[PDB]
Amino acid sequence: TKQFSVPNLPLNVMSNSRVPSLLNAMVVSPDQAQVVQFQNGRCTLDGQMLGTTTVSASCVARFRGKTFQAPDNRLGINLAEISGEPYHAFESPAPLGFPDFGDGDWHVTATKVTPSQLEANDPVVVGNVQPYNPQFAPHLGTLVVENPTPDQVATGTDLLFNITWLSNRANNRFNPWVIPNYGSTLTEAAQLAPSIFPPGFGETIVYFNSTFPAVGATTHAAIPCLLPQEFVAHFVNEQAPIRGEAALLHYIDPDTHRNLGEFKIYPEGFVTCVPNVGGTGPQSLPTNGVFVFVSWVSRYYQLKPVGTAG
Amino acid sequence: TKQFSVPNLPLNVMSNSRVPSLLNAMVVSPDQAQVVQFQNGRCTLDGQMLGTTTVSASCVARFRGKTFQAPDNRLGINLAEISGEPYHAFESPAPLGFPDFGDGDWHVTATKVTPSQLEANDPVVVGNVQPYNPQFAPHLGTLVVENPTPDQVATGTDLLFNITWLSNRANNRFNPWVIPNYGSTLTEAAQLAPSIFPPGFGETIVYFNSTFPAVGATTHAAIPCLLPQEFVAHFVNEQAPIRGEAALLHYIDPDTHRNLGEFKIYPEGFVTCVPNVGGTGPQSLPTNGVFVFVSWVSRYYQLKPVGTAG
Ligand SMILES: CC(=O)N[C@@H]1[C@@H](O[C@@H]2O[C@H](CO)[C@H](O)[C@H](O)[C@H]2O[C@@H]2O[C@@H](C)[C@@H](O)[C@@H](O)[C@@H]2O)[C@H](O[C@@H]2O[C@@H](C)[C@@H](O)[C@@H](O)[C@@H]2O)[C@@H](CO)O[C@@H]1O
Ligand SMILES: CC(=O)N[C@@H]1[C@@H](O[C@@H]2O[C@H](CO)[C@H](O)[C@H](O)[C@H]2O[C@@H]2O[C@@H](C)[C@@H](O)[C@@H](O)[C@@H]2O)[C@H](O[C@@H]2O[C@@H](C)[C@@H](O)[C@@H](O)[C@@H]2O)[C@@H](CO)O[C@@H]1O
Ligand SMILES: [Cl-]
Ligand SMILES: [Cl-]
Numbered sequence: 001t002k003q004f005s006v007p008n009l010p011l012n013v014m015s016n017s018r019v020p021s022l023l024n025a026m027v028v029s030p031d032q033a034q035v036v037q038f039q040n041g042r043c044t045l046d047g048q049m050l051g052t053t054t055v056s057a058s059c060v061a062r063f064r065g066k067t068f069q070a071p072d073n074r075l076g077i078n079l080a081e082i083s084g085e086p087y088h089a090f091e092s093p094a095p096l097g098f099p100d101f102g103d104g105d106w107h108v109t110a111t112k113v114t115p116s117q118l119e120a121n122d123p124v125v126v127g128n129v130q131p132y133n134p135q136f137a138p139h140l141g142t143l144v145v146e147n148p149t150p151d152q153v154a155t156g157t158d159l160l161f162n163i164t165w166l167s168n169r170a171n172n173r174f175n176p177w178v179i180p181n182y183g184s185t186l187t188e189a190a191q192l193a194p195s196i197f198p199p200g201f202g203e204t205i206v207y208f209n210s211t212f213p214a215v216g217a218t219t220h221a222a223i224p225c226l227l228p229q230e231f232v233a234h235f236v237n238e239q240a241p242i243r244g245e246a247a248l249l250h251y252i253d254p255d256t257h258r259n260l261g262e263f264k265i266y267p268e269g270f271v272t273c274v275p276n277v278g279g280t281g282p283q284s285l286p287t288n289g290v291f292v293f294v295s296w297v298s299r300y301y302q303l304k305p306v307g308t309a310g
Numbered sequence: 311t312k313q314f315s316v317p318n319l320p321l322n323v324m325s326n327s328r329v330p331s332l333l334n335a336m337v338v339s340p341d342q343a344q345v346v347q348f349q350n351g352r353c354t355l356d357g358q359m360l361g362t363t364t365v366s367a368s369c370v371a372r373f374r375g376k377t378f379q380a381p382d383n384r385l386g387i388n389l390a391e392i393s394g395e396p397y398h399a400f401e402s403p404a405p406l407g408f409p410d411f412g413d414g415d416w417h418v419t420a421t422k423v424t425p426s427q428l429e430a431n432d433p434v435v436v437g438n439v440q441p442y443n444p445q446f447a448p449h450l451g452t453l454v455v456e457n458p459t460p461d462q463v464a465t466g467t468d469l470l471f472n473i474t475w476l477s478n479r480a481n482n483r484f485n486p487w488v489i490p491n492y493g494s495t496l497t498e499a500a501q502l503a504p505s506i507f508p509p510g511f512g513e514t515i516v517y518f519n520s521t522f523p524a525v526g527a528t529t530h531a532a533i534p535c536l537l538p539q540e541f542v543a544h545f546v547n548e549q550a551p552i553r554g555e556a557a558l559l560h561y562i563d564p565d566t567h568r569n570l571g572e573f574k575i576y577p578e579g580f581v582t583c584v585p586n587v588g589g590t591g592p593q594s595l596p597t598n599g600v601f602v603f604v605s606w607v608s609r610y611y612q613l614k615p616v617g618t619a620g
């Protein structure tokens with residue numbers, strides 16, 4: 001009998017669930033090629049996270065591990081959870097929050113996190129991770145940092161990594177839809193968050209975008225996700241049981257309470273709308289509105305078209 | 311009619327409200343030398359943020375601005391809000407989320423954020439900010455990045471800054487309690503979040519600590535804050551009116567459901583406990599417990615001592 005709700009925070013104060021950035025737009029992308037299968041920002045309406053999704057904003061697209069010396073002055077990393085708890089294979093696709101961008105270089109900045117190594121001196125290590133490299137095995141807990149600086153880092157150093165920026169592979173653009181190949185063969189427990197297929201009734205998937213230093217992207221420096229991280233954290237906190245086939249939301253002007261558009265959020269944890277034909281759908285709406293739960297509805301509830309005709 | 315609550319997320323999945331890091335401890339510091347007056351992580355129980363506190367996890371201890379050339383190849387920054395909205399003086403102490411560490415160097419990593427500047431090439435600028443230097447004027451919207459790399463950045467470049475690490479000043483240790491001098495004279499509107507005084511009844515302030523690359527700290531790489539960021543986000547979302555002089559919380563083992571300790575959270579937005587005499591108070595409790603609202607209480611409700619005798 002805990003009733004379902006969404007966070008009533010304005011869109012442009014909530015954050016991406018695949019990079020640590022503010023949300024500043026929502027778009028649709030119906031005629032786009034890739035499957036939709038992000039591993040971060042995946043959460044059911046009753047609060048079960050899927051893939052590698054963490055509830056922790058400060059773990060989104062981070063990773064942590066201990067260093068070892070790999071061939072040709074490459075820096076191997078044995079992964080742990082960002083909390084420092086051990087990471088074991090065969091249970092999830094990768095550690096919690098682990099970045100899910102497969103189509104380009106991760107230019108990373110790391111710091112030492114052992115307090116005894118933080119009494120003095122420069123704790124930073126930088127480098128790049130190439131998820132398309134053959135020595136990228138996050139399911140089994142290991143990856144490589146190419147061209148580290150310093151070249152020489154003592155074995156067993158505990159490092160916490162951030163993605164400072166992403167870039168395209170040579171002669172391609174960087175597609176932020178493409179998830180990594182996590183390697184191995186995943187147990188049933190460690191299964192990827194499923195892919196999401198286009199719903200019916202003229203509906204198209206809604207993406208929440210952030211501007212992000214993603215250099216050479218197909219999207220013009222924009223990272224899409226299926227749910228704001230605050231939605232993930234809200235559903236995990238609430239654990240409201242699913243009581244309908246989908247959940248109708250209204251996107252409200254917060255001051256004047258006018259309804260700016262109708263959306264559906266499905267049990268599997270993604271939002272849809274029906275774009276006004278020939279326009280950008282929700283992209284033209286102001287970004288300072290607030291989502292509110294109206295009611296559960298069935299799958300065939302017909303949404304009012306949102307946006308302008310063009 | 312909206313009843314008060316706190317997020318029922320385990321402590322060690324919630325995040326600091328003064329740096330973007332996981333919480334991994336809670337401590338007390340009764341014989342602490344400094345006043346308690348953080349500007350980030352400040353929120354009333356009914357959801358009014360104070361100081362520079364933002365609701366947005368991805369704005370905590372970040373800042374943004376446009377570059378200009380300052381004397382001696384110093385890199386001046388004209389601040390904006392992290393959202394890119396303009397920042398104007400005389401309304402807040404500094405932009406939303408602006409870092410509130412005054413006692414040491416900020417070693418910062420910035421990226422370009424203009425999509426047209428992100429089609430190719432390396433978008434990173436690094437440097438350090440010295441909040442104790444005379445050209446640090448965050449209230450009026452301007453600061454300086456010393457020793458930038460590149461040392462030549464075009465004027466008017468939009469940059470988003472993160473604090474990669476902090477370090478002590480020469481011949482001192484870095485005290486993370488010390489807030490910056492924001493400069494100028496603050497209007498009534500732009501007032502600092504007030505300082506917090508020790509409450510009675512044998513209570514002492516509870517700090518939520520993160521391990522963080524703060525080099526040479528008085529705390530050994532630990533950043534304290536008064537509220538998890540998720541508490542800030544929760545109170546802003548809920549807006550539950552204050553209906554008592556303080557709010558009694560229990561810190562519950564989430565599986566065994568047993569009570570590990572009693573705490574009070576006050577309307578002004580800080581947590582207290584009564585340490586068992588001679589011990590570290592809440593510091594010895596497991597960090598995977600969950601805070602639960604019991605009831606409103608008066609200021610003179612007597613907490614059972616928490617922790618061990620030593
Ligand atoms: C090794 C190096 O410096 N290479 C330069 C190019 O940059 C590399 O380009 C690759 C794709 O072709 C890939 O994106 C690499 O990640 C990228 O290397 C990164 O960026 C450079 C600038 C350095 O900082 C490296 O340390 C870093 O790993 C560069 O290509 C241009 O920029 C990159 C970011 C990419 O957008 C590419 O498409 C652009 O043409 C070229 C020309 O500037 O110069 C070197 O080859
Ligand atoms: C300019 C420089 O390289 N200085 C070195 C010292 O580092 C500086 O120390 C200052 C305090 O005395 C202050 O913290 C500066 O921020 C710090 O400079 C930073 O760290 C160094 C290592 C470089 O990366 C700089 O680019 C950066 O700005 C260094 O002091 C020792 O480390 C620092 C972090 C601090 O903890 C200090 O107390 C330590 O003694 C010394 C000895 O290694 O070497 C240079 O002087
Ligand atoms: Cl019911
Ligand atoms: Cl709602």
Ligand SMILES: [Cl-]
Pocket residue numbers: 053054055056096323
């Ligand atoms: Cl989690």
Ligand SMILES: [Cl-]
Pocket residue numbers: 114115116117
């Ligand atoms: Cl240690």
Ligand SMILES: [Cl-]
Pocket residue numbers: 243244245
């Ligand atoms: Cl049903």
Ligand SMILES: [Cl-]
Pocket residue numbers: 297298299300301
């Ligand atoms: Cl219906």
Ligand SMILES: [Cl-]
Pocket residue numbers: 311
């Ligand atoms: Cl009532």
Ligand SMILES: [Cl-]
Pocket residue numbers: 311312313
């Ligand atoms: Cl209620």
Ligand SMILES: [Cl-]
Pocket residue numbers: 314315316317318601602603
């Ligand atoms: Cl509660």
Ligand SMILES: [Cl-]
Pocket residue numbers: 013363364365366406
């Ligand atoms: Cl805010």
Ligand SMILES: [Cl-]
Pocket residue numbers: 607608609610611
């Ligand atoms: Cl009482």
Ligand SMILES: [Mg+2]
Pocket residue numbers: 051091092093
């Ligand atoms: Mg899992």
Ligand SMILES: [Mg+2]
Pocket residue numbers: 361401402403499500
């Ligand atoms: Mg203000």
